[PDB]
Design a protein around this ligand. Sequence first.
Ligand SMILES: Cc1[nH]nc2c(NC3CC3)ncnc12
Length: 143
Amino acid sequence: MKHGRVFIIKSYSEDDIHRSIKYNIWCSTEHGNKRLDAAYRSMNGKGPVYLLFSVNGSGHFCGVAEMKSAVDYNTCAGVWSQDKWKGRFDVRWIFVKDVPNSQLRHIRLENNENKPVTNSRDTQEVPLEKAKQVLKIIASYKH
Ligand SMILES: Cc1[nH]nc2c(NC3CC3)ncnc12
């Protein structure tokens, strides 16, 4: 088996996130789709690709999903908040819960100039050991 690969997902539409949770699908930018497609295919089913979702300006992460398919680049147009989001891949949301950035901001990414994980861009990949730290904090956070 292989350890998971873990990516930050950012959205500036809460409605798009709602749709993602309801129907277990997502789409990124062109370069973001390529990045996730490469990772999913190179895993070759021997470990998961995890996605850590966060709405721009919300000050919190909102949950965790697993990538469940390769990217399909030719799908129905205009299904998201804006037309610029093209293509589709399946996801499985593992859990949905808000976790304040304050709980995560001291985790820094050595592959992103040691910036805090909470300052990441869409499809920023997370080093394994930091991803474990983030996932355990998110899993155990209590309001
Ligand atoms: C469906 C979708 N995929 N990426 C999205 C996004 N990314 C912005 C950079 C933060 N914003 C809104 N909807 C999106």
